[PDB]
């Protein structure tokens, strides 16, 4: 496919199905989630977005990422910090878990950030465009299963307040990915790193399930 947006969607089909048939998400679809499990997800998303956004800020000026840079529209660190404060208490930053599977993901983002930033779009595509697609339904499932209090906190991550229409922004975000100047050789590594990105996610759900069910 000529468009990067199409080429990434085409390449990741087998790895996305592999991620749908992850043991954790197999249960999540049927609404078989616990508070413990959700907390782990929420903590995972924190460590990943902290690293992703840290590396994005390093490379916002660079032509390899500048077009897809949407700080205000997409930033998730603060939303997640608000949630972890509710899930783990005001001393969340001292008590939240940092598992090896999380560490691998975080290590990759920091390596891609410093040594090959032209691939950072692959992770940005995976994380943002991924979490922008599923959030609405995944919240509806979580909300039903967890039966949390009327405290008005803890699910802030699932709302992108500076994005009016998710569908229109995804359109826009795809256009900006299509406008990225890159040799058909880097084009290869972006697709390969996107595959790597999915692998790290599935690998995470596997370590999470090994922890939750003893
Ligand atoms: C419960 C497990 C999952 C299900 C049922 C699922 C299914 C879906 C659905 C229904 C969409 C909406 C399609 C759209 O309107 O664009 C989507 C999009 C997407 N998902 Fe998932 N998914 C799951 C897990 C994952 C994981 C673990 C990742 C990797 C981080 C991922 C990455 C993506 C991406 C990048 C898109 C946007 C595709 C595009 O438009 O280019 N998904 N998926
Ligand atoms: O699956 C998605 C987010 C998912 C998740 C969590 C941690 C790491 C990677 C993914 C998650 C978020 C919040 C609660 C339960 C699960 C986005 N998605 C939906 C459809 N296609 C992509």
Numbering used by the authors: 10 to 223
From the paper:
The heme oxygenase (HO) system comprises two active isozymes (HO-1 and HO-2) which are involved in the regioselective, oxidative cleavage of heme at the α-meso carbon. Cleavage results in the release of equimolar amounts of the gasotransmitter carbon monoxide (CO), ferrous iron (Fe2+), and biliverdin, the latter of which is reduced further by biliverdin reductase to form bilirubin. Of the two active isozymes, HO-1 is a ∼32 kDa stress protein found to be predominantly expressed in the spleen and inducible by a variety of stimuli including heat shock, heavy metals, heme and reactive oxygen species (ROS). Our laboratory has been focused on a program aimed at the design of novel, non-porphyrin based, isozyme-selective HO inhibitors based on the structure of (2S, 4S)-2-[2-(4-chlorophenyl)ethyl]-2-[(1H-imidazol-1-yl)methyl]-4-[((4-aminophenyl)thio)methyl]-1,3-dioxolane (azalanstat), which was discovered as a potent and selective inhibitor of HO. This program has resulted in the discovery of several novel, azole-based compounds, deemed QC-xx, which selectively and non-competitively inhibit HO without affecting NOS or sGC, except at high millimolar concentrations, and do not induce expression of NOS, sGC, or HO-1.
